[PDB]
Design a binder for this molecule. Structure first.
Ligand SMILES: CC(=O)N[C@@H]1[C@@H](O)[C@H](O)[C@@H](CO)O[C@@H]1O
Ligand SMILES: CC(=O)N[C@@H]1[C@@H](O)[C@H](O)[C@@H](CO)O[C@@H]1O
Ligand code: NA
Ligand code: NA
Lengths: 403, 403
């Protein structure tokens, strides 16, 4: 394959999701849906009476479900959150303003999302493709928590002052908005709960938002495939437009990102409704894109595999990353994986490389890392692999407590 | 070798009384397990609880294990509508044990809300290895157990649909339990599928007389309570315990994991000078003395994270022995000595997953008649076997029979 494409759909489950899923199924591909469960409560200001049906269909069809937060941070778009808050924020269009405030409350939205999903579909944890507690993506934000050495934020994703299209819009990555700072904290809080978060390389969106029925201008399949070709191995998270979609410090050439393109789009762009005739005009674009992308040599995969699963029989080079039972690991020495030699907290063959900050066992800590342990912060003074006896509060030759 | 292992477990914190309890534990040189209800942090649990957050921090900093007792102790099922006054309202009626469990999905959800609230008031809590809020739980009112695949049992008269156990005409039929009890059984199962273990108790350190105006005063004295512990050692107390609503009728008497162990249940608020009596003045000395004389008698104290012994390299295990590893229960396949690189996992040849859960899972030894959930459907295990990736219930209609 010349590459791997990860189709990722945000903001479902809504009525529009149903036909999208069927197009994916007809195309013989799996995708990842980052869901907001407020649609299940009927307060997300979309056609969403089939929300539960859509959730069931995505899961029964084998697509991966991940976590986009319960309400898409709309509680930060309004004064008091309630059943009309989606409509109100849609009225004002202030989604990108003050999007993140209290990072603790905002992170908690991701856990509430789990509660609501498991309320409406009590059997959801019986699905191996339910990944709501492992894979997340922040609203508005092209941010990444993939490995210890693959993390980067969307430094101008959201704003404190005014929406980005306007004269005088200021974006300083070195001194980001309050909303962006808070969102960075949200990322860290999720990573410490074991989440990975992923941004995107290309955004399948209206070419022109100013025309009537803007959804109709979704990029046609042929030129969209052109965008994907251009993104392939080109660190497009740094070059993408608009500015609020950029990942300024994305680690270009990082090994896990090679030969891969993550596509972001939205289920709601594919319905005939308030944004245009998205079903009529866009379902065929999705279908054709899948076909021509395969013709060109691409294969489609899902985000649970973006970090490849540890696999018995495969030989690994030192430095390579795998995902095993939800945890990221990096090979310590080159070897061939065998049944009893899986990654773990005690394996000599692997170290834990989750994108987290809480002190953890079997991590290869580097000079300058800061970890949290029993409510305090510690600076790593000497590189080493962590172990049970070497806790930060008892190893002053390895850690120094910060103020 | 020690006479046995005692597990001190305190329920219904964190409250003011918890602080001095913790200090006594520390002076006694022991660790305990606190099953907390986080509503006290919100100041609506109708206790003296302005120091709730102080008590939580102290418990964790002191190395005690924090487990999950649900957010509101199911008080939402004691009143028509849950709110800031419900704790008080339920204490007025004394109907805690009636209709205690109703909608098991909502009730289970209270355990996850508990995590949100704990991680709200103490945002650093996940940096404590002794925070086990997402791994260890205990149901309100209920001597019920989800420990391993072959160590689970319910409190079949723990809660009632009408009368309380002491009221005339009250009937307990374990063979046809109350609707409240049936709901609680489903709650146990939901939690198990989220990776929780739940544990009941062997002895309950409580008023010897609830009919006086200061019942806390009659808490069993240290010496006779130690006599209760001796009595409970290896004698299947959960079956013989009184009152009837504290029984675990089908507890697996003699099960190896319970050998030479006694779990003590008590409550932080029994050690308070307050509405229940002079608990701090009279009972803190009882606790302190108990610890001292128990140790003198040859007992050692441990916590519930070790009740199922943690896997440790260099230790020898026998076929059928259980360990806990990274929060997951495993059962040894053959006699062997644990090595660094050979840890229990989903692919190990030396171990099988033996979590007390019902969702289909890799590397589990399934018995005939087991019922597993998979992608929203239920399946009877028709052919006992050890599960593997290629033998999913939806593709294996000889091993499994759809229900
Ligand atoms: C112009 C447009 O389609 N905006 C939508 C908004 O309506 C929606 O509530 C939000 C969360 O789903 O996503 C986007 O910001
Ligand atoms: C008699 C007594 O102390 N009952 C308490 C009740 O007051 C409390 O609200 C509940 C939850 O903490 O636990 C017990 O049922
Ligand atoms: Na993870
Ligand atoms: Na567990």
């Amino acid at each position: 394959p010349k590459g791997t494409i990860y189709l990722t759909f945000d903001d479902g489950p809504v009525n529009a999701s149903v036909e999208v899923i069927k197009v994916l199924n007809q195309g013989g591909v799996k995708a990842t849906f980052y869901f907001n469960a407020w649609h299940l409560d009927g307060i997300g200001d979309e056609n969403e009476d089939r929300a539960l049906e859509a959730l069931k269909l995505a899961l029964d069809s084998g697509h991966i479900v991940g976590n986009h937060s319960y309400d898409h941070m709309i509680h930060n778009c309004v004064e008091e959150f309630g059943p009309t808050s989606g409509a109100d924020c849609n009225a004002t269009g202030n989604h990108q303003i003050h999007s993140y405030q209290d990072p603790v409350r905002d992170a908690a939205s991701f856990e509430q999302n789990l509660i609501t999903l498991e309320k409406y579909l009590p059997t959801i944890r019986s699905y191996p493709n339910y990944k709501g507690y492992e894979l997340a993506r922040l609203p508005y934000t092209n941010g990444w928590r993939v490995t210890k050495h693959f993390q980067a934020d969307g430094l101008c994703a959201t704003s404190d002052n005014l929406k980005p299209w306007e004269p005088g819009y200021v974006c300083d990555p070195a001194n980001p908005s309050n909303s962006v700072k808070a969102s960075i904290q949200v990322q860290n809080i999720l990573a410490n709960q074991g989440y990975q978060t992923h941004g995107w390389d290309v955004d399948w969106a209206p070419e022109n938002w100013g025309i009537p029925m803007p959804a109709n201008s979704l990029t046609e399949a042929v030129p969209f495939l052109a965008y994907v070709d251009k993104a392939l191995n080109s660190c497009s998270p740094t070059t993408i437009e608009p500015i609020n979609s950029k990942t300024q410090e994305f680690p270009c050439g990082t090994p896990l990102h090679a030969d891969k393109v993550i596509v972001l789009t939205h289920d709601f762009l594919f319905e005939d409704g308030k944004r245009g005739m998205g079903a009529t005009q866009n379902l065929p674009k999705l279908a054709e894109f899948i076909r021509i992308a395969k013709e060109a040599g691409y294969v489609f995969d899902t985000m649970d595999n973006y970090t490849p699963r540890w696999s018995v029989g495969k030989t690994y080079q030192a430095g390579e990353y795998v995902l095993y039972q939800g945890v990221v690991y990096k090979a310590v020495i080159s070897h061939t994986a065998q049944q009893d030699w899986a990654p773990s907290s005690t394996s000599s063959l692997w170290t834990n490389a989750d994108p987290a900050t809480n002190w953890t066992l079997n991590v290869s800590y580097e000079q300058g890392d800061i970890v949290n342990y029993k409510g305090k912060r510690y600076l790593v003074s000497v590189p080493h692999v962590s172990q049970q006896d070497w806790t930060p509060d008892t190893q002053n030759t390895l850690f120094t407590a910060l103020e």
